[PDB]
Amino acid sequence: PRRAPAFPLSDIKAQMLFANNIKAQQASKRSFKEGAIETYEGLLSVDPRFLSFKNELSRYLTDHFPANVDEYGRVYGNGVRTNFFGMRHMNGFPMIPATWPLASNLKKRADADLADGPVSERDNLLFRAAVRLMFSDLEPVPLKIRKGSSTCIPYFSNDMGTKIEIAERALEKAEEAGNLMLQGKFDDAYQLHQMGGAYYVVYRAQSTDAITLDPKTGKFVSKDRMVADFEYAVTGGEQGSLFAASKDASRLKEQYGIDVPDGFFCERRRTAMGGPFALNAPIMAVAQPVRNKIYSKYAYTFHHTTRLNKEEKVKEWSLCVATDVSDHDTFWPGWLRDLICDELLNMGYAPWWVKLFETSLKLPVYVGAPAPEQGHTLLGDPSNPDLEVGLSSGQGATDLMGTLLMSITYLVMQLDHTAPHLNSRIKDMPSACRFLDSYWQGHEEIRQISKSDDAMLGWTKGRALVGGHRLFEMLKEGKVNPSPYMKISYEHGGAFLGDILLYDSRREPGSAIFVGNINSMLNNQFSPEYGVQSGVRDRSKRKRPFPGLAWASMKDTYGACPIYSDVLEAIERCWWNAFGESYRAYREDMLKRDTLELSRYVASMARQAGLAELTPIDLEVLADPNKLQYKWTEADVSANIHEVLMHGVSVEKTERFLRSVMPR
Numbered sequence: 001p002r003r004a005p006a007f008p009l010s011d012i013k014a015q016m017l018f019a020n021n022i023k024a025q026q027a028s029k030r031s032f033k034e035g036a037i038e039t040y041e042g043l044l045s046v047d048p049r050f051l052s053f054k055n056e057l058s059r060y061l062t063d064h065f066p067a068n069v070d071e072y073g074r075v076y077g078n079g080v081r082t083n084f085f086g087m088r089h090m091n092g093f094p095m096i097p098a099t100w101p102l103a104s105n106l107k108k109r110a111d112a113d114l115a116d117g118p119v120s121e122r123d124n125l126l127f128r129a130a131v132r133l134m135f136s137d138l139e140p141v142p143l144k145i146r147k148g149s150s151t152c153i154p155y156f157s158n159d160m161g162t163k164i165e166i167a168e169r170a171l172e173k174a175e176e177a178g179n180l181m182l183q184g185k186f187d188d189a190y191q192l193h194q195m196g197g198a199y200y201v202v203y204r205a206q207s208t209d210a211i212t213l214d215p216k217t218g219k220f221v222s223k224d225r226m227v228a229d230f231e232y233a234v235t236g237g238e239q240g241s242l243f244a245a246s247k248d249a250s251r252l253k254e255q256y257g258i259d260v261p262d263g264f265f266c267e268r269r270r271t272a273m274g275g276p277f278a279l280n281a282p283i284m285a286v287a288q289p290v291r292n293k294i295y296s297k298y299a300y301t302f303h304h305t306t307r308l309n310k311e312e313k314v315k316e317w318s319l320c321v322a323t324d325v326s327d328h329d330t331f332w333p334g335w336l337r338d339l340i341c342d343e344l345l346n347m348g349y350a351p352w353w354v355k356l357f358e359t360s361l362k363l364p365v366y367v368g369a370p371a372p373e374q375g376h377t378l379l380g381d382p383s384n385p386d387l388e389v390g391l392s393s394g395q396g397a398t399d400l401m402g403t404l405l406m407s408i409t410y411l412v413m414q415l416d417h418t419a420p421h422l423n424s425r426i427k428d429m430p431s432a433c434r435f436l437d438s439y440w441q442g443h444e445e446i447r448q449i450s451k452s453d454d455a456m457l458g459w460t461k462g463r464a465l466v467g468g469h470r471l472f473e474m475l476k477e478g479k480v481n482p483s484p485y486m487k488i489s490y491e492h493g494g495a496f497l498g499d500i501l502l503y504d505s506r507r508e509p510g511s512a513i514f515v516g517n518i519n520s521m522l523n524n525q526f527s528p529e530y531g532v533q534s535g536v537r538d539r540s541k542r543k544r545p546f547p548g549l550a551w552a553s554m555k556d557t558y559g560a561c562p563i564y565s566d567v568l569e570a571i572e573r574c575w576w577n578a579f580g581e582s583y584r585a586y587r588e589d590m591l592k593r594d595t596l597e598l599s600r601y602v603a604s605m606a607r608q609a610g611l612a613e614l615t616p617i618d619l620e621v622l623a624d625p626n627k628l629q630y631k632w633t634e635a636d637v638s639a640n641i642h643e644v645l646m647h648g649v650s651v652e653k654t655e656r657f658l659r660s661v662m663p664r
């Protein structure tokens with residue numbers, strides 16, 4: 001029932017994705033690679049002392065700090081939600097094979113009993129109202145670019161100067177490209193302006209994943225991760241197979257001479273997609289202004305910073321429901337892309353821009369290396385973009401596409417199961433906008449705090465409260481999906497954007513507090529996703545620019561966890577046993593070295609200026625800028641720090657571009 005076309009690297013369609021330069025040619029051909037990450041300078045993830053440390057620590061902490069999660073998934077007591085065995089992976093060595101990305105998610109959605117469009121007129125008005133509220137009265141801002149990020153297809157440049165030139169040229173030629181696409185001239189738009197082609201698939205590590213200890217055998221068991229073979233991916237699951245990837249690490253001894261202790265596994269690998277930068281630049285020029293609007297006007301629902309910022313909102317609720325979405329990106333509906341595009345057109349957005357936006361969400365995908373002897377295949381024909389992959393991770397507005405889908409999905413759930421008395425407030429477009437604008441500001445008796453697939457749903461006192469409790473009960477039972485749009489359940493140990501909601505004996509939001517997740521501190525410190533990249537001279541271009549700095553923000557981030565001191569002492573004791581060294585002293589030296597190095601990058605910082613002016617967010621972001629992609633935003637970071645990590649295209653060029661896109 002319609003298989004996606006697939007082309008080998010040798011085919012002209014795939015060759016046209018890679019420019020005649022070394023980096024682009026190497027990206028096309030790069031074979032499956034694996035190896036121990038440099039966890040910290042001079043320390044490999046597979047160092048026997050380090051693995052001994054992880055074995056002792058994971059065992060000790062699980063033993064002394066068992067999970068304290070009630071029947072309703074509320075975390076209490078010690079603030080622990082699971083075992084500490086997630087650290088037991090051979091970081092840098094992936095599970096084999098990684099998945100082939102599904103070319104079409106239509107069958108996947110239909111088989112999961114999810115809708116192929118808005119179910120009712122109300123829902124149609126609410127999704128359209130979300131577009132109207134989000135894309136409205138936008139103010140131009142400079143187009144900010146992450147330092148060291150790739151331009152991907154076709155140039156594969158990491159040079160800031162080249163990236164600035166590409167973005168400026170893209171804003172100049174986006175109209176001409178979009179008009180070519182409106183005429184079905186995708187090849188011309190790509191050939192002339194590099195707008196089109198495909199997403200470049202890279203496989204990224206999820207460094208920690210579920211591991212359990214079988215009491216009967218005393219053997220560890222890793223969580224099975226289902227992967228699609230090539231046949232399954234091109235047929236949207238009609239043919240081929242979906243099977244468990246192998247996390248068995250025994251192979252490392254034979255292949256690499258690495259001693260593998262018992263109960264240590266290969267890492268979970270996730271697909272990540274890099275977009276063609278010339279196509280993303282015009283999209284990002286609108287996406288950043290949208291973020292600024294939603295994080296300002298709709299800050300209640302959308303702008304999340306500290307544990308206290310979150311706590312102030314939640315404390316006022318009579319009921320707090322922490323939801324979970326199954327595989328958000330792969331289930332994300334193409335009908336939403338079409339609805340968004342249709343509404344933008346109705347608002348008066350430039351048709352050429354809407355076509356670029358639509359095209360970015362139908363684009364083919366170039367598969368690199370999921371396993372040895374596999375990959376190097378283009379899925380979909382770039383001459384006529386028609387894929388249904390769900391949400392591509394490298395699309396210029398992915399966060400906004402997930403936020404738009406989910407914010408409405410949760411409101412619909414609250415309407416359907418708890419507040420039918422509010423349905424009369426949604427009669428047409430003006431009333432749908434008025435209602436949504438009030439709801440997003442936290443002015444209704446039904447509330448939410450969300451970001452993409454993470455949310456907390458609230459009820460104050462009122463008519464909807466009783467329904468709220470029935471919905472929570474329905475979730476606990478887990479027999480009926482409460483949504484026609486996505487697979488929704490409750491989170492087993494409710495947390496929001498990394499902070500655990502710690503309840504007391506009362507099990508009420510009013511007396512509950514947000515605390516940092518101690519397990520995330522452990523994940524970040526002992527299982528980083530990337531190595532230190534010691535060979536990359538420019539630290540601002542590394543995946544972990546200043547790792548040592550995280551020690552300075554630790555107490556601020558994690559200090560409120562009931563077991564904070566206990567964990568730090570357990571670390572010290574175990575590190576002493578494994579290395580014969582003080583972990584605290586080791587981290588204090590790393591903090592000193594990184595603080596000194598940082599002044600080289602900050603113009604306001606003198607040769608030995610300390611971290612006095614820096615916030616804990618600034619420090620966490622400098623140690624892990626990936627937190628800027630899922631946890632925080634540009635506005636949450638000090639201005640002098642933002643400039644270390646990003647560079648921008650002038651507001652003059654974006655202002656002129658934006659004027660041509662927008663209705664008014």
Ligand SMILES: Nc1nc2c(ncn2[C@@H]2O[C@H](COP(=O)(O)OP(=O)(O)OP(=O)(O)O)[C@@H](O)[C@H]2O)c(=O)[nH]1
Nearest residue numbers: 206270454494495496497498499520523529626630
């Ligand atoms: N802990 C962690 N998660 C990440 C990171 N980068 C991306 N994620 C994503 O966050 C999700 C993992 O959830 P968890 O490890 O259980 O905890 P969390 O996302 O950090 O926070 P909560 O969902 O509020 O519980 C996946 O969808 C990941 O792809 C990272 O650096 N650290």
Ligand SMILES: [Mg+2]
Nearest residue numbers: 454455491495
């Ligand atoms: Mg959650």
